[model samples]
Target: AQYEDGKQYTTLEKPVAGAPQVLEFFSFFCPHCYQFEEVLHISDNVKKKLPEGVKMTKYHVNFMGGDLGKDLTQAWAVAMALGVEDKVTVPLFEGVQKTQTIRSASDIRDVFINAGIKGEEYDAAWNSFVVKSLVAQQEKAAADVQLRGVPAMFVNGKYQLNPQGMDTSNMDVFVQQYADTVKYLSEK
Candidate 1:
């Protein structure tokens, strides 16, 4: 495996300050992201493998979903605001990427409703100022990353992970290497 600036990862122009921080940028419209969430389950595995005190943040990108990208981000904000991302993430991934069921914000709202949240509650959260700011911040973060693809990960807000530089022949090895690299970079 290789490790160098612009090779394995690129150094951010303005690094985010937070040690042991790992941020994932993905989109529901991305097929690979769907695989990561449902099939590969890389995020879940990586999260589990990380040691205590590591902060992992998932940011839903607003470029891949086209016109609906912002809405999807807003939906995610609503879910996060309501503390139901665990229940809504998979459903949104399945509905948008796999089953092709979700198409609008209302459709996203339904997913939250199906997760046992009330319709009014979803509406309230969606309209809240906190959710609005969160969606804007999410959009800005994606733009700042200058991302070229989904499932991209940034560690310590400075290095963007290069999965191609790691041994990705199998899941077990990949997750371990990924977790190790994250930990190593977090303390760098």
Candidate 2:
């Protein structure tokens, strides 16, 4: 649907090199993101559809700073640090949306505990420099993307197709458009 040297926007205002970044901007607080994780199953389904040499990173959007937003962002950043994002991603959202089980870092740590990460690993990453730096970077990055809403995506730093913004609000159509867009980009 568009073109431009296979590059676009950036959270850091500079490209994240290595491979084309297929970035995901979302928030656990957003019911749309909750549905994307639980109902749409975008994480798993789309992961399978991602083209080779494409690297994906999920940003828990925090354009609006708040306590809950900060905490969930930390939860996810630490999850990434621990190398257990897939383990905690859906269940953490489920834990929040359905069980109301994860609200604080300790609550998230408990979820991590259940997922088999040790307390020390959780402790280190939870309050570590890397996590803090990433969360800070993401705050600006959210603004950098000019993020307007949850469950938004960018292929190679530039905004691509958003399911909610495209031909239909249908999640399935969004998935197809997302795949096709990424497929087209990968071939470029």
Question: Which candidate number maximizes TM-score?
Answer: 1
Model 2 misplaced regions, further than 4 Å: 1-20, 165-174, 185-188
User: Which residue pairs come into collision in candidate 2?
Assistant: 9-157
lDDT of 1 by residue, 30-82 (tens): 88788778777778777876777877888887777777777898888887788
| Model 1, global lDDT | 0.79
In model 1, the worst 10-residue window by lDDT is 1-10
- Kindly list the per-residue Cα lDDT of model 2 for residues 1-188, writing each as its tens digit: 35333333123345434423666778877787888777777766666777666667788875433676778887778887777888888777877778887677678778888999999888888879999988876676676656777777666664454453345567687666656656665455
TM-score of each: 0.88, 0.78
Q: What's the distance in Å from true for residue 85, model 1? A: 0.9
